[PDB]
Amino acid sequence: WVPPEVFDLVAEDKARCMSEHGTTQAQIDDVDKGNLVNEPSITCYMYCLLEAFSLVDDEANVDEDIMLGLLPDQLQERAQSVMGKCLPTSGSDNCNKIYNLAKCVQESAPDVWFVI
Amino acid sequence: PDWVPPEVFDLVAEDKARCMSEHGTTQAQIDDVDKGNLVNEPSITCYMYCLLEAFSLVDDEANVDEDIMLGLLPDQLQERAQSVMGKCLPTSGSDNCNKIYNLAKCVQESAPDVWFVI
Numbered sequence: 001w002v003p004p005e006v007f008d009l010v011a012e013d014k015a016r017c018m019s020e021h022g023t024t025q026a027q028i029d030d031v032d033k034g035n036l037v038n039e040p041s042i043t044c045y046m047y048c049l050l051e052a053f054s055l056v057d058d059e060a061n062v063d064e065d066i067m068l069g070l071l072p073d074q075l076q077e078r079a080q081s082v083m084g085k086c087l088p089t090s091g092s093d094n095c096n097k098i099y100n101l102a103k104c105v106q107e108s109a110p111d112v113w114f115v116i
Numbered sequence: 117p118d119w120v121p122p123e124v125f126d127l128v129a130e131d132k133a134r135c136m137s138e139h140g141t142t143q144a145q146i147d148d149v150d151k152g153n154l155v156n157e158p159s160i161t162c163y164m165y166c167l168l169e170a171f172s173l174v175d176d177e178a179n180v181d182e183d184i185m186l187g188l189l190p191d192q193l194q195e196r197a198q199s200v201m202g203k204c205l206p207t208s209g210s211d212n213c214n215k216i217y218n219l220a221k222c223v224q225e226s227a228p229d230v231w232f233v234i
């Protein structure tokens with residue numbers, strides 16, 4: 001009569017991206033509180049996490065409709081204004097593109113930090 | 117220029133709070149849903165709809181995005197998910213929220229041991 005096994009989607013996706021890039025819990029805690037650094041082990045994790053959610057493609061191009069789709073109706077205009085300052089992405093590789101995007105988001109709206 | 121601690125906002129926590137509030141959903145109901153026990157009541161089913169839409173898993177016309185959904189599921193569960201989504205999509209029901217109820221019941225009948233929480 002058993003209850004199902006309950007899979008925490010987010011924790012699965014985070015887990016899989018960590019083990020792929022050698023990312024430590026410490027590093028993801030740093031990102032979770034707004035501290036960014038341009039180190040592949042953590043920045044490729046950020047690229048990986050976004051990709052898992054279809055927010056980016058295999059080149060770290062942002063899907064704007066899906067990214068705006070993460071946020072409530074009340075924040076759409078602020079997000080679009082940040083997206084007009086930070087997109088299209090750019091950098092040396094997929095990981096660096098996401099570092100530069102995360103840094104561009106932080107300085108454009110420094111008072112809030114949005115995490116998955 | 118100079119770094120200041122930002123107010124940190126957990127999107128998933130915020131989504132749950134807004135959907136709860138928008139659909140008159142109690143905490144007890146949310147807990148039932150996270151264990152996989154469902155009722156065909158709007159305060160539950162529209163809450164599920166609201167959570168899914170917040171991740172572009174569905175649109176605002178009860179159309180589900182299979183590619184997005186597959187991207188979130190664990191590697192354990194890819195072959196099974198494609199088989200279950202093959203049987204359960206496209207969605208079907210009397211209204212937006214009921215469509216998601218039928219999809220949830222379809223998933224459960226087809227894979228009784230698997231359930232997902234956001």
Ligand SMILES: [Cl-]
Binds near residue numbers: 039040041042
């Ligand atoms: Cl590194």
Ligand SMILES: [Cl-]
Binds near residue numbers: 061
């Ligand atoms: Cl882009």
Ligand SMILES: [Cl-]
Binds near residue numbers: 086096
């Ligand atoms: Cl960028």
Ligand SMILES: [Cl-]
Binds near residue numbers: 089090091092
């Ligand atoms: Cl570039």
Ligand SMILES: [Cl-]
Binds near residue numbers: 046114115116
């Ligand atoms: Cl992030």
Ligand SMILES: [Cl-]
Binds near residue numbers: 178179205
């Ligand atoms: Cl559908």
Ligand SMILES: [Cl-]
Binds near residue numbers: 210211212
């Ligand atoms: Cl309808």
